Write a protein that binds this ligand. Sequence first.
Ligand code: NA
Ligand code: NA
Lengths: 407, 407
Amino acid sequence: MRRVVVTGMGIVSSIGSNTEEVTASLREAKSGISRAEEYAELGFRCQVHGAPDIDIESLVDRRAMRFHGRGTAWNHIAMDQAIADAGLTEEEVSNERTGIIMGSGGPSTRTIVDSADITREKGPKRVGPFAVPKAMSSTASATLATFFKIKGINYSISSACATSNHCIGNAYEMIQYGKQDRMFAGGCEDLDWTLSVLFDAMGAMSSKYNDTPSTASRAYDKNRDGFVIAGGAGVLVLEDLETALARGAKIYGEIVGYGATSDGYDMVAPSGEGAIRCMKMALSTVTSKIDYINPHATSTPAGDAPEIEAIRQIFGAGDVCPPIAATKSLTGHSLGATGVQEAIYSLLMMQNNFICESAHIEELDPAFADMPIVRKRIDNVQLNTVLSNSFGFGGTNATLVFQRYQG
Amino acid sequence: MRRVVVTGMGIVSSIGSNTEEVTASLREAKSGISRAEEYAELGFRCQVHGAPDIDIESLVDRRAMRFHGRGTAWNHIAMDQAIADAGLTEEEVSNERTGIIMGSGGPSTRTIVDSADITREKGPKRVGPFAVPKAMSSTASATLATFFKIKGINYSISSACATSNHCIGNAYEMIQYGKQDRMFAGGCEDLDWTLSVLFDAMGAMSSKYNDTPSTASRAYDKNRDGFVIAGGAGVLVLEDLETALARGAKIYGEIVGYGATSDGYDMVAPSGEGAIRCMKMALSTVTSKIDYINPHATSTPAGDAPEIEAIRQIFGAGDVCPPIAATKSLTGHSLGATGVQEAIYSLLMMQNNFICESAHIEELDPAFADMPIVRKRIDNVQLNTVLSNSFGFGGTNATLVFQRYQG
Ligand code: NA
Ligand code: NA
């Protein structure tokens, strides 16, 4: 099997509109969470969100936008960034050896709702002729594959919170097995009340911190009370190692493990044992120690703990366990985009030799007092190998391990 | 790479609620298309659909239904059928070597719309706490993986019309490469105005035949005027050959090729060249001649022809070209479910030694007069190798080739 490296990254996040902004946010523990006035207007319990702040119209032209939902527009931007970062020629983007696996946890629910509304108010024709590609689950791959003239693999993987971890992992497999030499992998999610309300109604999102929105997402805090939803996108450019080397690519890291498992247990809550198997699977092909864990931890009572127990089972507790820092405390949970975004945060931490604070831990949950949850940014750390989990609704688990490329 | 066989099938279709019903419909060219009175009420141009006729509540119990949309409920039924057909024990369904890749072209758009409506009418709490797994793009995998206690791979691939062809192909790869020994693969789609309207608004669905709904889907007819949307589901049980043999499995066929490519051209229209590359890729691992092509052909002016030209390029014209019979003329286009359903129709035709009529060709389009489009059911034919295309919006292409297992 071939080796596979990350040669470019692009990101639209609640904590920044490019990798530089994101890095600064990570370094300074700058929360991307703000009040969602619309959620309050609609009567939600949760009135916070992680909203990107980026001018789509300035970055994606009108014809390009014809078939985009906002999530995929953000993914388009991320794709442009990743292509630029990678320094790819048009030929390198568009060829039979280059594919795309790009997913979202949902499609444009706003398109779906707006279309239903307008059908009933003004008639079906007034939906307009461009809604299908926005509304379909493959929207992220369909739109980008078409616009970027992708000729290889083209589909979306969806797996809720794990979506873009699976997208990356499957793309990794594609290249490992020699089916593609380059892949664009990642995912996106719109941020819209029509999606967020589904989570609010299940009581899944934080509401106790509406008056201090910036600190609402607080993985491992004793008083965490649900996740904070976000939107955005991320893209990695993946290449087989020879391809990367031959063109003098940047190498942000090497993908060295990928785990994917299923809990087969509960729709909304993790089992824990699935995560253990997922991490073990990811680690089964990894020879070096893990220097940092980017957990799934979404700031939920029921979610943060079983993952920590899974980590304890694999890695132990205290100093021997890799440092753990939950980036969702800063970023919220962007569902389809989370996996790739977390890969990017981890690769940026690797690049910049620091591990961010696991933010907003005002009082650590005592259940986690034995674990190396990062309470203050760690500087001057040589990260060589980083592990990132995403454990999604439906008991779907994906773990990725990235390594600093040193030959 | 390991060999991979189909050991069980389940299906919920506009042309039958199980494989026996489906086989009878195929044999007798019994259309599954009917008038959609609701579409007329809503002012659609297209007033036809392919609706399953199956009593969900009698087949999936209430607790089981908690997190199902209708599409995934149909997929649940199909999964139950496939498990029964395969004769799997509970242990064989639920184990670390057994996974699920099950997708839909969209999620429950009805859940999304109903939730938005009720949020605005009665408040967000009244969405209820069970909407996320119905609304998310991974709904088909999440629901089934959880209910069936799947422990291996668990995610959805979405690729519009190609969805469940990719699901099957990726599951095939999983087993080929030794990652899983058994996979449940397939997909589903609800049939609901909230999805169908998106296609009506783009003028994609047939409207000239509303007065004769049964014949509205008419691939290759000169006067075809758009596809007919359908809902349903299908599941294949895939196993590595040794696993299948060792347990005395039924073998419906062997998956012997899988192509996946991207047009990188137009969002709604096929390029043709992508399909050629897709079929070639599928055929690259196939040693026997193709005895039957189950085309993508959805009964559209712009769609049916480029695929025929692609077929002509690979296979030639006339007698030397494999017989082509568009099952969507009977079934309509069930989007996420189409690929797996067409695999099942093809495997059932293989099992039963006939090729169905390519239905509703009242006047063949003269552009296709050179091609072996099946005008009357062909009986007493030994099908050993069958090819099925699905070429979806966003220029996403998937082709599968199945072979009669003879050692
Ligand atoms: Na993570
Ligand atoms: Na087909």
